[PDB]
Amino acid sequence: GAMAQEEAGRLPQVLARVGTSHGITDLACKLRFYDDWAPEYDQDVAALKYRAPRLAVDCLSRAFRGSPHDALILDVACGTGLVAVELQARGFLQVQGVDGSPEMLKQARARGLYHHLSLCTLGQEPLPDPEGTFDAVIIVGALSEGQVPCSAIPELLRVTKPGGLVCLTTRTNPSNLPYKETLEATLDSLERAGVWECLVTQPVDHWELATSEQETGLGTCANDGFISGIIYLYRKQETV
Numbered sequence: 001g002a003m004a005q006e007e008a009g010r011l012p013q014v015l016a017r018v019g020t021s022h023g024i025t026d027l028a029c030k031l032r033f034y035d036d037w038a039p040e041y042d043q044d045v046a047a048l049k050y051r052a053p054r055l056a057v058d059c060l061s062r063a064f065r066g067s068p069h070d071a072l073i074l075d076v077a078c079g080t081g082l083v084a085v086e087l088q089a090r091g092f093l094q095v096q097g098v099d100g101s102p103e104m105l106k107q108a109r110a111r112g113l114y115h116h117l118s119l120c121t122l123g124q125e126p127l128p129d130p131e132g133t134f135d136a137v138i139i140v141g142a143l144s145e146g147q148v149p150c151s152a153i154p155e156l157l158r159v160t161k162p163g164g165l166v167c168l169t170t171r172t173n174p175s176n177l178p179y180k181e182t183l184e185a186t187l188d189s190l191e192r193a194g195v196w197e198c199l200v201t202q203p204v205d206h207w208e209l210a211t212s213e214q215e216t217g218l219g220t221c222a223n224d225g226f227i228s229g230i231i232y233l234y235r236k237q238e239t240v
C-alpha cells in the first residue's frame with residue numbers, strides 16, 4: 001500500500017502481508033525497515049512530552065482496585081520497554097500482549113516483564129488476544145493514524161474483562177481537530193451502551209501545540225494549531 005494505507009491501515013497491512021508467511025528473512029526485513037526510523041520515533045515522544053507513561057501507569061493503579069500482581073495485564077505493540085520496567089516496579093507481575101518490532105519486543109520480552117508477547121501488527125482488524133482474557137491493557141503511542149485505528153482499540157477492550165482498565169496515549173488531534181469533541185462523544189455512546197465507562201483523562205502537552213497563549217496572529221510562524229499527545233483510562237463494561 002501507499003502511505004500506510006492512508007495513514008490508517010499501516011499495521012493492518014502487516015497482518016495482510018504476514019498471512020502468506022514463510023518469509024522470516026523478509027518479514028524481519030519489513031520490520032527492520034520500521035525499526036530503522038524506530039530510534040527517531042523514540043526521541044519524538046520526548047519532544048512531544050508524553051507524560052502519559054508517568055501519570056498513565058500511576059493513574060491505572062490508583063483506579064485499578066485489583067492488583068496487577070494477581071490480575072492479568074495486556075500491552076500492545078506500543079508496550080515500550082521502559083513502560084514495562086516502570087510497570088513492573090509499579091506492581092505489575094503479570095503481562096501479555098503483542099508487538100510488531102522485535103526491538104520493541106526485545107525490551108518487553110528480554111526485559112522478562114511480559115509473560116507472553118506475540119508478533120502481529122493490526123489496526124482495521126481484531127486484536128490477537130481473546131475476550132475476557134486480561135484484567136487490564138496498557139498501550140502507548142498507538143492510535144488512529146496508521147498505527148492503531150481507534151475502532152480496533154475497542155477490540156483490546158473486548159479482550160479486557162468488565163471492571164478492567166485500558167490505558168492509551170498518542171496524538172489527540174493529528175488531524176480532524178474538531179473531530180476530537182466528536183470523538184469524545186463516541187466514547188460516551190459506548191459508555192452509555194455499557195461497553196466501557198471513561199474514568200479520567202490525564203493532562204499532556206496536546207493543548208499548547210494547537211493553541212498558543214500569544215494568539216492566532218502569525219499562526220504559521222507560531223507552528224501551532226494541532227493538538228497531540230494525550231493519555232486516558234477507561235473502565236471495561238460499565239453502566240453510563
Ligand SMILES: Nc1ncnc2c1ncn2[C@@H]1O[C@H](CSCC[C@H](N)C(=O)O)[C@@H](O)[C@H]1O
Pocket residue numbers: 011034035037038039041042076077078098099100101104119120121122123141142147148
Ligand atoms: N498492532 C500492532 N502490532 C504490531 N506492532 C504494532 C502494532 N501497532 C503498532 N505497532 C508498532 O508500531 C510501530 C510502527 S512503525 C515503527 C516506528 C517506531 N518503532 C514507533 O514506535 O512508532 C512498530 O514498532 C510496530 O511494531
